[PDB]
Structure formats: structure tokens, C-alpha cells
Amino acid sequence: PQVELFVKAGSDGAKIGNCPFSQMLFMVLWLKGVTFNVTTVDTKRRTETVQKLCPGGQLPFLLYGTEVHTDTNKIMEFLEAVLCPPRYPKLAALNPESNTAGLDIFAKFSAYIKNSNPALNDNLEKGLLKALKVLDNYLTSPLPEEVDETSAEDEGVSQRKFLDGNELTLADCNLLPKLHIVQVVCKKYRGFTIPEAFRGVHRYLSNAYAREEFASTCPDDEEIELAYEQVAKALK
């Protein structure tokens, strides 16, 4: 059953551009173990093929057999329901709160980065830090699979690699691409790095960069930086 993901091209019109939703789906497809390919689209220079396939012009989109699917969340839910055991792993998180943890972070960063008002900068860095902190608390809070197993020096502190346990789940495919943007953009434009003291977050990002499903599907740092150049440069 043929599977082809269409994604937003970057600045040369060929390579992967900045698009967390595109990366999210590329991640799900990789984690499913399914045979798929990926076509980048220069949206300013669309092939007649892509034009016929997806008249609405939405990106990303998925061709599955003969059927075109748009809307990233809906595609994700479709992939989860159509690619099941025993042939493909379920990737849905077991704990519903894994799906909501960290979700307000991208919006705090969006306000932070778009801001050009100096008296509001310190408020906005704080809103972003507090959001990251709440994700940190999630990542260090033991989940039901870890019930009552510990180490005297680290009691009540989760050792798990990712949001919902030790395997990547749909919840990570959603958050990780957004959190990667946050990291790259804020370093480049705002002298900002996630504090060391957020150890859950740092371990998470570290175990994520160790995984080729995340790392190989990231657009280059340049591509993300260029995407944000106009909105980010505004703060004097």
C-alpha cells in the first residue's frame, strides 16, 4: 500500500524546510516501520503532479494508496488507526497527560520571539521558562509503569527516556519538532538556552537527539533560523 508524504521545501526549494507538523508525520511514519517515501514541495514552484494531487494546496499532505489526506492531526490519527499490530506498532501514549504535557510551550516561545517591546521581554522569557518547567516536572514525575521501583538517592524521580515511558510515542512526535525550533531559534536570536537546572528536559532532548527518527528528520539549523529571521530580528 503506497505511502507518500509531501512536505514543505526549504530555501533552495529541495531540502526539508521549517515545518514541525511535517517533521511530526515523518517521525510517525519512520516509527511505524512502514515503507514510505517523502517528496519536498517548493510551494512557489509546484509540480503539476502535486497540483493535481492536492488542489487545496495544503502542506504537509499524505498520499495513501490512491487517497489524499490533509490536516496533520487527522493524518496522524489515521496513520495510528490504519497501521496496527501485528505488522506495525501502536504509538499512542498510554497516559493521556503525556499528550498534553509541554503543549503551551510553543505559544509562549511564539510571543517571546515575535516580541519587539523591551519592557515585555523579561515577562515573556519568564512565561516560556515556567512552561518549560512544567514539562520538566512531567518528565521527572514517575509514571504508573514505574510504581514503587526506585533508588534511595533519587526517590520519586523518573528515570524514563521520553514523555510516556522508554519508547517514542505520538506525543513525542508532536512535541519534539516544536521544542527543537524553540531551542534553535532562541539560541540564535535571543541569547537564550534552556537552563541546566531543567534536568528532565535536558535528558529528554539528549535521548531524543540520540534517536535517528528525530535527528534525521530535523531540518538544518540554518533553515529554521531563516524561517524566523524576519519576526525575530524585530527586538532592539
PDB file of C-alpha atoms in Angstrom:
ATOM      1  CA  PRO A   1       0.000   0.000   0.000  1.00  0.00           C
ATOM      2  CA  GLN A   2       1.833   3.084  -1.194  1.00  0.00           C
ATOM      3  CA  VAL A   3       2.648   5.843   1.248  1.00  0.00           C
ATOM      4  CA  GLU A   4       3.991   9.169   0.197  1.00  0.00           C
ATOM      5  CA  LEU A   5       4.333  12.148   2.473  1.00  0.00           C
ATOM      6  CA  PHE A   6       4.544  15.603   0.859  1.00  0.00           C
ATOM      7  CA  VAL A   7       6.427  18.236   2.815  1.00  0.00           C
ATOM      8  CA  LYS A   8       7.337  21.904   2.650  1.00  0.00           C
ATOM      9  CA  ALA A   9      10.751  22.524   0.913  1.00  0.00           C
ATOM     10  CA  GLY A  10      13.368  24.871   2.342  1.00  0.00           C
ATOM     11  CA  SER A  11      15.235  27.813   0.938  1.00  0.00           C
ATOM     12  CA  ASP A  12      16.882  26.053  -2.026  1.00  0.00           C
ATOM     13  CA  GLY A  13      13.442  24.575  -2.917  1.00  0.00           C
ATOM     14  CA  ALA A  14      14.726  20.986  -2.376  1.00  0.00           C
ATOM     15  CA  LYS A  15      15.768  20.291   1.192  1.00  0.00           C
ATOM     16  CA  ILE A  16      13.394  19.890   4.171  1.00  0.00           C
ATOM     17  CA  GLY A  17      12.110  23.301   5.293  1.00  0.00           C
ATOM     18  CA  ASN A  18      10.989  24.529   8.707  1.00  0.00           C
ATOM     19  CA  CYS A  19       7.690  22.844   9.441  1.00  0.00           C
ATOM     20  CA  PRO A  20       7.142  20.995  12.747  1.00  0.00           C
ATOM     21  CA  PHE A  21       3.924  19.289  11.511  1.00  0.00           C
ATOM     22  CA  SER A  22       5.752  17.855   8.510  1.00  0.00           C
ATOM     23  CA  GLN A  23       8.511  16.565  10.864  1.00  0.00           C
ATOM     24  CA  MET A  24       5.845  15.103  13.151  1.00  0.00           C
ATOM     25  CA  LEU A  25       4.441  12.952  10.373  1.00  0.00           C
ATOM     26  CA  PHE A  26       7.862  11.970   9.032  1.00  0.00           C
ATOM     27  CA  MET A  27       8.561  10.757  12.622  1.00  0.00           C
ATOM     28  CA  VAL A  28       5.325   8.757  12.874  1.00  0.00           C
ATOM     29  CA  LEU A  29       5.991   7.084   9.500  1.00  0.00           C
ATOM     30  CA  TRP A  30       9.557   6.190  10.496  1.00  0.00           C
ATOM     31  CA  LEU A  31       8.376   4.821  13.888  1.00  0.00           C
ATOM     32  CA  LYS A  32       5.714   2.691  12.220  1.00  0.00           C
ATOM     33  CA  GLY A  33       8.296   0.743  10.210  1.00  0.00           C
ATOM     34  CA  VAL A  34       6.217   1.178   7.039  1.00  0.00           C
ATOM     35  CA  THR A  35       7.744   1.661   3.566  1.00  0.00           C
ATOM     36  CA  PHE A  36       7.172   5.241   2.574  1.00  0.00           C
ATOM     37  CA  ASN A  37       8.815   7.995   0.627  1.00  0.00           C
ATOM     38  CA  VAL A  38       8.867  11.768   1.129  1.00  0.00           C
ATOM     39  CA  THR A  39       8.640  14.481  -1.503  1.00  0.00           C
ATOM     40  CA  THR A  40       9.583  18.057  -0.687  1.00  0.00           C
ATOM     41  CA  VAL A  41       7.447  20.749  -2.360  1.00  0.00           C
ATOM     42  CA  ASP A  42       8.626  24.256  -3.396  1.00  0.00           C
ATOM     43  CA  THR A  43       5.223  25.840  -2.776  1.00  0.00           C
ATOM     44  CA  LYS A  44       6.188  28.716  -5.084  1.00  0.00           C
ATOM     45  CA  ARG A  45       7.098  26.294  -7.867  1.00  0.00           C
ATOM     46  CA  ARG A  46       4.578  23.375  -7.527  1.00  0.00           C
ATOM     47  CA  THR A  47       4.863  20.453  -9.983  1.00  0.00           C
ATOM     48  CA  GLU A  48       1.639  19.701 -11.934  1.00  0.00           C
ATOM     49  CA  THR A  49       1.568  16.294 -10.119  1.00  0.00           C
ATOM     50  CA  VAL A  50       1.358  17.952  -6.685  1.00  0.00           C
ATOM     51  CA  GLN A  51      -1.129  20.483  -8.128  1.00  0.00           C
ATOM     52  CA  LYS A  52      -3.476  17.666  -9.239  1.00  0.00           C
ATOM     53  CA  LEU A  53      -2.943  15.579  -6.102  1.00  0.00           C
ATOM     54  CA  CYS A  54      -3.778  18.339  -3.651  1.00  0.00           C
ATOM     55  CA  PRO A  55      -5.822  21.161  -5.179  1.00  0.00           C
ATOM     56  CA  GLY A  56      -6.390  22.883  -1.792  1.00  0.00           C
ATOM     57  CA  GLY A  57      -2.603  23.399  -1.754  1.00  0.00           C
ATOM     58  CA  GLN A  58      -2.246  22.318   1.927  1.00  0.00           C
ATOM     59  CA  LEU A  59       1.191  21.171   3.221  1.00  0.00           C
ATOM     60  CA  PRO A  60       2.026  18.725   4.504  1.00  0.00           C
ATOM     61  CA  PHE A  61      -0.196  16.088   2.842  1.00  0.00           C
ATOM     62  CA  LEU A  62      -0.186  12.322   2.650  1.00  0.00           C
ATOM     63  CA  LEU A  63      -0.912  10.082  -0.279  1.00  0.00           C
ATOM     64  CA  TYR A  64      -2.032   6.737   0.974  1.00  0.00           C
ATOM     65  CA  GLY A  65      -2.657   4.336  -1.867  1.00  0.00           C
ATOM     66  CA  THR A  66      -4.883   6.491  -4.078  1.00  0.00           C
ATOM     67  CA  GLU A  67      -6.273   8.772  -1.323  1.00  0.00           C
ATOM     68  CA  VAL A  68      -5.027  12.213  -0.336  1.00  0.00           C
ATOM     69  CA  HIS A  69      -5.301  13.237   3.343  1.00  0.00           C
ATOM     70  CA  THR A  70      -4.709  16.730   4.644  1.00  0.00           C
ATOM     71  CA  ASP A  71      -4.679  18.167   8.237  1.00  0.00           C
ATOM     72  CA  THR A  72      -1.723  16.982  10.285  1.00  0.00           C
ATOM     73  CA  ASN A  73      -3.559  15.835  13.457  1.00  0.00           C
ATOM     74  CA  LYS A  74      -6.150  13.979  11.349  1.00  0.00           C
ATOM     75  CA  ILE A  75      -3.453  12.302   9.233  1.00  0.00           C
ATOM     76  CA  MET A  76      -1.683  11.285  12.458  1.00  0.00           C
ATOM     77  CA  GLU A  77      -4.806   9.683  13.819  1.00  0.00           C
ATOM     78  CA  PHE A  78      -5.453   7.995  10.523  1.00  0.00           C
ATOM     79  CA  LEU A  79      -1.866   6.512  10.471  1.00  0.00           C
ATOM     80  CA  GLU A  80      -2.282   5.278  14.040  1.00  0.00           C
ATOM     81  CA  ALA A  81      -5.548   3.562  13.229  1.00  0.00           C
ATOM     82  CA  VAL A  82      -4.581   2.060   9.809  1.00  0.00           C
ATOM     83  CA  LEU A  83      -1.042   0.911  10.698  1.00  0.00           C
ATOM     84  CA  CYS A  84      -1.700  -1.530  13.629  1.00  0.00           C
ATOM     85  CA  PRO A  85      -0.410  -4.820  15.090  1.00  0.00           C
ATOM     86  CA  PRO A  86       0.854  -7.250  14.394  1.00  0.00           C
ATOM     87  CA  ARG A  87       2.597  -5.662  11.392  1.00  0.00           C
ATOM     88  CA  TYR A  88       3.108  -2.160  12.913  1.00  0.00           C
ATOM     89  CA  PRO A  89       3.465  -0.910  16.467  1.00  0.00           C
ATOM     90  CA  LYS A  90       0.773   1.241  18.115  1.00  0.00           C
ATOM     91  CA  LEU A  91       2.491   4.530  19.008  1.00  0.00           C
ATOM     92  CA  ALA A  92      -0.306   6.114  21.042  1.00  0.00           C
ATOM     93  CA  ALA A  93       0.778   7.138  24.599  1.00  0.00           C
ATOM     94  CA  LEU A  94      -0.724   5.061  27.491  1.00  0.00           C
ATOM     95  CA  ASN A  95      -1.130   8.021  29.882  1.00  0.00           C
ATOM     96  CA  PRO A  96      -3.445  10.795  28.497  1.00  0.00           C
ATOM     97  CA  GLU A  97      -1.364  13.559  30.211  1.00  0.00           C
ATOM     98  CA  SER A  98       1.651  12.610  28.026  1.00  0.00           C
ATOM     99  CA  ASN A  99      -0.441  14.115  25.208  1.00  0.00           C
ATOM    100  CA  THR A 100      -0.916  17.473  26.857  1.00  0.00           C
ATOM    101  CA  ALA A 101       2.409  17.895  28.662  1.00  0.00           C
ATOM    102  CA  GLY A 102       4.517  20.662  27.159  1.00  0.00           C
ATOM    103  CA  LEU A 103       1.733  21.814  24.758  1.00  0.00           C
ATOM    104  CA  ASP A 104       1.669  25.505  25.860  1.00  0.00           C
ATOM    105  CA  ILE A 105       5.420  25.897  25.256  1.00  0.00           C
ATOM    106  CA  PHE A 106       5.346  26.722  21.526  1.00  0.00           C
ATOM    107  CA  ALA A 107       2.864  29.550  22.026  1.00  0.00           C
ATOM    108  CA  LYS A 108       4.974  31.104  24.842  1.00  0.00           C
ATOM    109  CA  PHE A 109       8.018  30.955  22.567  1.00  0.00           C
ATOM    110  CA  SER A 110       5.958  32.469  19.699  1.00  0.00           C
ATOM    111  CA  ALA A 111       5.140  35.522  21.814  1.00  0.00           C
ATOM    112  CA  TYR A 112       8.717  35.674  23.156  1.00  0.00           C
ATOM    113  CA  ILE A 113      10.293  35.568  19.685  1.00  0.00           C
ATOM    114  CA  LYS A 114       7.798  37.869  17.928  1.00  0.00           C
ATOM    115  CA  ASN A 115       8.075  40.404  20.688  1.00  0.00           C
ATOM    116  CA  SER A 116       9.693  43.688  19.807  1.00  0.00           C
ATOM    117  CA  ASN A 117       8.672  45.548  23.038  1.00  0.00           C
ATOM    118  CA  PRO A 118      11.662  45.724  25.521  1.00  0.00           C
ATOM    119  CA  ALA A 119       9.626  46.168  28.759  1.00  0.00           C
ATOM    120  CA  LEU A 120       7.809  42.949  27.915  1.00  0.00           C
ATOM    121  CA  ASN A 121      10.914  40.847  27.202  1.00  0.00           C
ATOM    122  CA  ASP A 122      11.587  39.707  30.785  1.00  0.00           C
ATOM    123  CA  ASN A 123       7.895  38.793  31.361  1.00  0.00           C
ATOM    124  CA  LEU A 124       7.912  36.702  28.151  1.00  0.00           C
ATOM    125  CA  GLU A 125      11.210  34.838  28.982  1.00  0.00           C
ATOM    126  CA  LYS A 126       9.626  34.010  32.342  1.00  0.00           C
ATOM    127  CA  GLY A 127       6.349  32.678  30.712  1.00  0.00           C
ATOM    128  CA  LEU A 128       8.487  30.490  28.458  1.00  0.00           C
ATOM    129  CA  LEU A 129      10.666  29.262  31.381  1.00  0.00           C
ATOM    130  CA  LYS A 130       7.664  28.444  33.535  1.00  0.00           C
ATOM    131  CA  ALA A 131       6.118  26.356  30.659  1.00  0.00           C
ATOM    132  CA  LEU A 132       9.402  24.519  30.192  1.00  0.00           C
ATOM    133  CA  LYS A 133       9.478  23.973  33.944  1.00  0.00           C
ATOM    134  CA  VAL A 134       6.003  22.346  33.916  1.00  0.00           C
ATOM    135  CA  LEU A 135       7.236  19.999  31.163  1.00  0.00           C
ATOM    136  CA  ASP A 136      10.331  19.297  33.353  1.00  0.00           C
ATOM    137  CA  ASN A 137       8.051  18.374  36.277  1.00  0.00           C
ATOM    138  CA  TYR A 138       6.162  15.994  33.959  1.00  0.00           C
ATOM    139  CA  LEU A 139       9.327  14.267  32.768  1.00  0.00           C
ATOM    140  CA  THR A 140      10.693  13.728  36.292  1.00  0.00           C
ATOM    141  CA  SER A 141       7.334  12.516  37.772  1.00  0.00           C
ATOM    142  CA  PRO A 142       7.243   8.689  37.782  1.00  0.00           C
ATOM    143  CA  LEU A 143       4.528   7.210  35.544  1.00  0.00           C
ATOM    144  CA  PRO A 144       2.327   4.204  36.622  1.00  0.00           C
ATOM    145  CA  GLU A 145       4.784   1.689  34.926  1.00  0.00           C
ATOM    146  CA  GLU A 146       7.438   2.853  37.399  1.00  0.00           C
ATOM    147  CA  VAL A 147       5.306   2.229  40.534  1.00  0.00           C
ATOM    148  CA  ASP A 148       7.411   1.852  43.730  1.00  0.00           C
ATOM    149  CA  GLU A 149      10.697   0.976  41.946  1.00  0.00           C
ATOM    150  CA  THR A 150      13.479   3.376  42.951  1.00  0.00           C
ATOM    151  CA  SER A 151      16.980   4.176  44.118  1.00  0.00           C
ATOM    152  CA  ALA A 152      17.443   5.688  47.637  1.00  0.00           C
ATOM    153  CA  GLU A 153      19.390   8.682  46.186  1.00  0.00           C
ATOM    154  CA  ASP A 154      16.682   9.512  43.618  1.00  0.00           C
ATOM    155  CA  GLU A 155      13.377   8.620  45.277  1.00  0.00           C
ATOM    156  CA  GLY A 156      10.229   9.709  43.416  1.00  0.00           C
ATOM    157  CA  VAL A 157      12.267  10.809  40.411  1.00  0.00           C
ATOM    158  CA  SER A 158      11.506   9.290  36.970  1.00  0.00           C
ATOM    159  CA  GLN A 159      14.343   7.666  35.013  1.00  0.00           C
ATOM    160  CA  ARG A 160      12.314   7.224  31.774  1.00  0.00           C
ATOM    161  CA  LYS A 161      13.724   8.381  28.438  1.00  0.00           C
ATOM    162  CA  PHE A 162      10.677  10.054  26.910  1.00  0.00           C
ATOM    163  CA  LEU A 163       7.150  11.546  27.684  1.00  0.00           C
ATOM    164  CA  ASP A 164       5.239   8.322  28.239  1.00  0.00           C
ATOM    165  CA  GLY A 165       7.967   5.774  29.015  1.00  0.00           C
ATOM    166  CA  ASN A 166      11.021   4.417  27.239  1.00  0.00           C
ATOM    167  CA  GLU A 167       9.646   4.330  23.665  1.00  0.00           C
ATOM    168  CA  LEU A 168       8.734   7.276  21.485  1.00  0.00           C
ATOM    169  CA  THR A 169       5.012   7.740  21.160  1.00  0.00           C
ATOM    170  CA  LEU A 170       2.858  10.085  19.084  1.00  0.00           C
ATOM    171  CA  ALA A 171       3.109  12.581  21.960  1.00  0.00           C
ATOM    172  CA  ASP A 172       6.912  12.933  21.370  1.00  0.00           C
ATOM    173  CA  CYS A 173       6.471  13.185  17.587  1.00  0.00           C
ATOM    174  CA  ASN A 174       4.263  16.202  18.312  1.00  0.00           C
ATOM    175  CA  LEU A 175       6.321  17.929  20.934  1.00  0.00           C
ATOM    176  CA  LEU A 176       9.897  17.243  19.835  1.00  0.00           C
ATOM    177  CA  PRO A 177       9.775  19.091  16.500  1.00  0.00           C
ATOM    178  CA  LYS A 178       8.284  22.175  18.266  1.00  0.00           C
ATOM    179  CA  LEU A 179      10.753  22.072  21.106  1.00  0.00           C
ATOM    180  CA  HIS A 180      13.625  21.764  18.572  1.00  0.00           C
ATOM    181  CA  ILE A 181      12.509  25.026  16.894  1.00  0.00           C
ATOM    182  CA  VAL A 182      12.284  26.671  20.306  1.00  0.00           C
ATOM    183  CA  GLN A 183      15.908  25.656  21.088  1.00  0.00           C
ATOM    184  CA  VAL A 184      17.415  26.642  17.740  1.00  0.00           C
ATOM    185  CA  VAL A 185      15.575  29.994  17.323  1.00  0.00           C
ATOM    186  CA  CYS A 186      16.085  31.261  20.917  1.00  0.00           C
ATOM    187  CA  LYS A 187      19.851  30.432  20.878  1.00  0.00           C
ATOM    188  CA  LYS A 188      20.250  32.219  17.526  1.00  0.00           C
ATOM    189  CA  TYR A 189      18.203  35.337  18.235  1.00  0.00           C
ATOM    190  CA  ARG A 190      17.698  35.787  21.948  1.00  0.00           C
ATOM    191  CA  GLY A 191      20.900  34.573  23.647  1.00  0.00           C
ATOM    192  CA  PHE A 192      18.619  32.088  25.411  1.00  0.00           C
ATOM    193  CA  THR A 193      19.251  28.466  26.307  1.00  0.00           C
ATOM    194  CA  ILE A 194      17.094  26.117  28.452  1.00  0.00           C
ATOM    195  CA  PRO A 195      18.577  26.330  31.934  1.00  0.00           C
ATOM    196  CA  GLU A 196      20.803  23.430  33.061  1.00  0.00           C
ATOM    197  CA  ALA A 197      18.586  23.114  36.150  1.00  0.00           C
ATOM    198  CA  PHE A 198      15.814  21.698  33.955  1.00  0.00           C
ATOM    199  CA  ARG A 199      17.403  18.277  34.028  1.00  0.00           C
ATOM    200  CA  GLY A 200      14.291  16.266  32.921  1.00  0.00           C
ATOM    201  CA  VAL A 201      14.023  18.478  29.803  1.00  0.00           C
ATOM    202  CA  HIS A 202      17.771  18.183  29.041  1.00  0.00           C
ATOM    203  CA  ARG A 203      17.872  14.359  29.407  1.00  0.00           C
ATOM    204  CA  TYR A 204      14.721  14.149  27.225  1.00  0.00           C
ATOM    205  CA  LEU A 205      16.341  16.301  24.492  1.00  0.00           C
ATOM    206  CA  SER A 206      19.553  14.307  24.786  1.00  0.00           C
ATOM    207  CA  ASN A 207      17.760  10.923  24.477  1.00  0.00           C
ATOM    208  CA  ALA A 208      15.806  12.451  21.547  1.00  0.00           C
ATOM    209  CA  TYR A 209      18.908  13.646  19.659  1.00  0.00           C
ATOM    210  CA  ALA A 210      20.305  10.072  20.150  1.00  0.00           C
ATOM    211  CA  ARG A 211      17.389   8.745  18.104  1.00  0.00           C
ATOM    212  CA  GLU A 212      17.643   8.900  14.329  1.00  0.00           C
ATOM    213  CA  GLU A 213      13.851   9.167  13.926  1.00  0.00           C
ATOM    214  CA  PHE A 214      14.133  12.613  15.491  1.00  0.00           C
ATOM    215  CA  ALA A 215      17.582  13.685  14.479  1.00  0.00           C
ATOM    216  CA  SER A 216      17.445  12.659  10.769  1.00  0.00           C
ATOM    217  CA  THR A 217      14.099  14.361  10.259  1.00  0.00           C
ATOM    218  CA  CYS A 218      15.119  17.763  11.659  1.00  0.00           C
ATOM    219  CA  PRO A 219      15.538  20.485   9.063  1.00  0.00           C
ATOM    220  CA  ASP A 220      19.062  22.047   9.223  1.00  0.00           C
ATOM    221  CA  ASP A 221      19.571  24.732  11.875  1.00  0.00           C
ATOM    222  CA  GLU A 222      20.018  27.300   9.041  1.00  0.00           C
ATOM    223  CA  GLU A 223      16.565  26.500   7.655  1.00  0.00           C
ATOM    224  CA  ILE A 224      14.834  27.055  10.978  1.00  0.00           C
ATOM    225  CA  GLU A 225      16.894  30.213  11.659  1.00  0.00           C
ATOM    226  CA  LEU A 226      15.989  31.725   8.213  1.00  0.00           C
ATOM    227  CA  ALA A 227      12.320  30.894   8.760  1.00  0.00           C
ATOM    228  CA  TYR A 228      12.231  33.108  11.830  1.00  0.00           C
ATOM    229  CA  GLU A 229      14.664  35.804  10.649  1.00  0.00           C
ATOM    230  CA  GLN A 230      12.009  38.431   9.955  1.00  0.00           C
ATOM    231  CA  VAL A 231       9.831  38.079  13.063  1.00  0.00           C
ATOM    232  CA  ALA A 232      12.772  37.512  15.407  1.00  0.00           C
ATOM    233  CA  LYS A 233      15.077  40.368  14.347  1.00  0.00           C
ATOM    234  CA  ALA A 234      12.492  42.982  15.362  1.00  0.00           C
ATOM    235  CA  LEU A 235      13.545  43.240  19.046  1.00  0.00           C
ATOM    236  CA  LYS A 236      16.155  46.011  19.513  1.00  0.00           C
TER     237      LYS A 236
END
